[PDB]
Amino acid sequence: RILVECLLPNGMIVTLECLREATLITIKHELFKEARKYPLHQLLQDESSYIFVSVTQEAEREEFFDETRRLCDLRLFQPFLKVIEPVGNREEKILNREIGFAIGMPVCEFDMVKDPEVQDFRRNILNVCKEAVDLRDLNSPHSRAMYVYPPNVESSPELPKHIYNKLDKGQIIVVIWVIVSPNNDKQKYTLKINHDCVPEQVIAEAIRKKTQGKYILKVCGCDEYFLEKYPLSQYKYIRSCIMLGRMPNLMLMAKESLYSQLPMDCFTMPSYSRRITSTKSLWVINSALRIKILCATYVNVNIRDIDKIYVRTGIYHGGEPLCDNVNTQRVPCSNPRWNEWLNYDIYIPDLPRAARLCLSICSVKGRKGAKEEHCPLAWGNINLFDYTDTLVSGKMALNLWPVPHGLEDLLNPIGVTGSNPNKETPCLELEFDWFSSVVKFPDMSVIEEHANWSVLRENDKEQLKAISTRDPLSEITEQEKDFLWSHRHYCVTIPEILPKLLLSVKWNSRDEVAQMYCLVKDWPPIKPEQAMELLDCNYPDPMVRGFAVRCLEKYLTDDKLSQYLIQLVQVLKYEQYLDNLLVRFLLKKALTNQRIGHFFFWHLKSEMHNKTVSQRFGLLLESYCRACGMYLKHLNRQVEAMEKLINLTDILKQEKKDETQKVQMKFLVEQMRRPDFMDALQGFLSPLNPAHQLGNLRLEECRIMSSAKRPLWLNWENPDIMSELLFQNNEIIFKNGDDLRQDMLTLQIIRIMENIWQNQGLDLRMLPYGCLSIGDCVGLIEVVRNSHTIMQIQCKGGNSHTLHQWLKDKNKGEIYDAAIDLFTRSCAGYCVATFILGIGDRHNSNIMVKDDGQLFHIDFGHFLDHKKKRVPFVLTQDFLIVISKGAQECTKTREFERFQEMCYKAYLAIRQHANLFINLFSMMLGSGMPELQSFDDIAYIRKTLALDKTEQEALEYFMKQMNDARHGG
Amino acid sequence: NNNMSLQDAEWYWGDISREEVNEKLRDTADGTFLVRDASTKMHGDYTLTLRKGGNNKLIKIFHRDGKYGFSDPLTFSSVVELINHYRNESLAQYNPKLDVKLLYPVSKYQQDQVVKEDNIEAVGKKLHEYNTQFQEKSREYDRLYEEYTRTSQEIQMKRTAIEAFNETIKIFEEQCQTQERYSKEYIEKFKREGNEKEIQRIMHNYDKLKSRISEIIDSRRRLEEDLKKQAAEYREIDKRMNSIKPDLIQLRKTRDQYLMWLTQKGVRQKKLNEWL
């Protein structure tokens, strides 16, 4: 159904017509019969030995070695083909088109980059990729199954004694299914076993009751496996059936049926792998630092609104200046040329290894009195040493970046370094002083010589202890920096004081930095929760950041790495060179564990629209997708299904924007009925949980919601053979138009709060559902079954007693008391959690309640007070009537006094872990979220947790804020 | 007489937050200072904040038994005396690495007078003037920032399409250079012996190629003209945002200084959320 012009290899052109679902073999076969009716058809050869070549919509000249693709999958620019003979590696041209489809950009664009740091990274990162493929391939085929199906366990084998008491005498009852007959005879075997036996001792009893191992255990309904030896109660599945009163269902498979669905995969080195005097130390120069500003190419300023412009510079070591800033002279807006040496109060040998130049072009309006009005136009940052330890010399050109929305400072020391890859932007010319040689930064044997050149009981061990346990954003005076630095040899006794002793160093003094290096080299390791603080933007030094990465690689478990993977991907934007120890650590982990590799993929992929990071993250996606094995085909199917839904919902947003739910809901059933939409959106793994495999779509139930941005309710079958024990429908919201990064962070914090409360002796049950961000304001939301908003229950039930009558109607008699104690232990968690995070505008459209009484909050949006940078709670009298069991005096019962004791206990246990929550927000400052831009925006958490008060003055601050949110409306 | 009360000093600010002092020492000469209450909110602590070397230094004032000062030999009668001892002697007498004097005190009555007419009948109207003009600017700014990112994304689509034409045109022209030298001097001239092959097979073919080659060069040229026009409106929307951005910092400062000198100080008025 389209004319395709075909350029034969004898200078002749043809107009061939084909149907749009035709493979390349079909069109190629059809071409050399229509071509024998043309003049020089005896020069040609047989159809083989030829292939096609064309241009794609990403401006790529593409050779189609894969003859089974079809005419509509090609993404051509113009409808034409061309016959040539095949030059190139055939198995390698096929992998490059799969990799380029997953990450969203052609792999050929990386070859056309001339930066030698970029080309060093590409071939030097292939060394990590090879050492992992040898590691997940060592003891086979077991080691290959552990990679694909890794154990989802807890970090700790010991049960909280309040969880242990839900097991009678340390016994668990399990139901072990066995499919025996060829006609699916489902046998069940109920057992009772110690909570700490291993899965080879569980199987050993299921065989005696039915009358190396030959069998594995699987979770019925979701293809999770128990392969590695652990106590049974440490797997998160068995651990979550002990604290919910449910029964675990396990099915007894055979090893040969799992080992045989593992497709083998091999790693081969790419094409670019095969490809490819007198020096002065930094510490022998004797001169101040100076830089020359030549001119700016163009700036977009009006002549009748702005008087002058100038260039503002500064030297920085991670957010702090190393000297006072220096301006140029103010010139007229139409002649930006300065030709001016600027002089800095930094001496050349006193520059630290992570110094940067930060500059902006600024305008002066003034024009009214004396208080001049200054405003930045464009910013840019430069490293003063490059990735080979060389000080930068000679002329330089730099394209600048637009000011971030919501910023008014004059410099931007937290932005990225490098030129704007767009080139029709303001370009500023620079000039660095030349010292008749190549100048290198010293090496650490010369630095240890200098430390030993510039180089007893006490009773104030109690001042070092008080400083050690203080907030990561607490004030430090000048007297305490002098005190910390002079007692620096006894601080190795309080190993967790290292973050505070590093902010006492003078970094513009090479004598003090040399002594600090010798002191980090012998430092005792610290907990991975405390080493993650050393990886944000206040600690740029590379000797400090390698100490932090070494503490993670010894003490961070896969369980906690999954917990903290969002933050470990944002601090990649802070590293100053492409090749570094944090990127080698994270890539090693994602190539030995697909649960980690799955989410590592989607967190980098969702930020490829960002031009400040796209080349960094693109080179790293290229390296993962080249060694991930057979999992690149699963990812390719998830990218095709997501791109179908983005294209579909774009139609509903700007072509059906005004229509009604009848004409739109019929367009949707049209579009989804097409047989190509039906193959993309059916039979793929879920991105929210890659253990949940989606099946046949259920089109009758899919619908267009009436929420803000009109998301998609979608519904799949669970194709598992024992799906009936677990759920049977995967229901997912697709949303296109909302930023889902504040919700991922909110839902991650709540899952950390709950774990602190569970390990204290409290049972406040949270519901942190699934949420994933896949691109620029597009994402996926897990749906909870058997749940209603408070607003549905109030309308269906029609008053203030509606919710309590609904909740008794659903469960009668002996189980009315368990429905009341679960509504109460749930409402106390979301009451404390939403106060600490600053989450407001809670109403009956964004609070939901299950059938069994449990409660949860949804659709958070803005978390800190981003609006004001009181509205008493309106459902207060409705939840009081539930908490007091429908009594008459709600606020005076013994049941309401236990509601308050649980909130007080939960508030004071989060306040004991305030440093963990300060750091998780600090690691997100360059993320790009508008609520979280400076260290001034994290100050909200220090107010609600009352960190400057004492423990009794804080609790009275909580009681006084809750009383102000009482009955209200 | 230079030892007045600490509550009437110009450089004393009471209880203001740490992040509200960072908005007053931002890009000021080395030697600017003020004093406030310590963050603990226990009275008699008095942290001093000094600007020096591009940074904000933070120095504690101790209170042994009616004395004041920096170190343990507290030898001053009061804070106002201590501040005056160092407005004439450099701070190198305390720390040699801190060679600077207290030069430029951040006064409270220099900028608080930026507002005038402490009536409530006046400033309510002057607050109404600014709160209307301020938020009318933000309705004109954040509209432009919306048109700015949309014009940026359409510039980038066009530039990729121009690269798609350049690679497409590059293979036709190499396809007509094999039409002749590969075939049209050694098969056409050799066998020209009264054939009907010439005018149809070779000529008619090669003349529908050139009709197709130039039709591609006419769509590239039509797109290249909408990119020049599209890159000119993108610089006019970036000039206008550069002249609105300065006007809109001045309004917020002249507008917020009203809310915190008459409506919250001159009268405890819950009408401020009702004025607006």
Ligand SMILES: Cc1cc([C@@H](C)Nc2ccc(Cl)nc2C(=O)O)c2nc(N3Cc4ccncc4C3)n(C)c(=O)c2c1
């Ligand atoms: C039954 C009930 C009572 C209250 C408050 C009004 N009463 C107390 C709470 C704890 C204690 Cl220990 N005592 C009291 C007391 O009044 O004595 C609630 N408060 C919230 N809030 C409050 C708040 C403040 C600031 N930002 C966000 C938020 C969300 N929610 C989301 C609730 O479901 C809720 C439920």
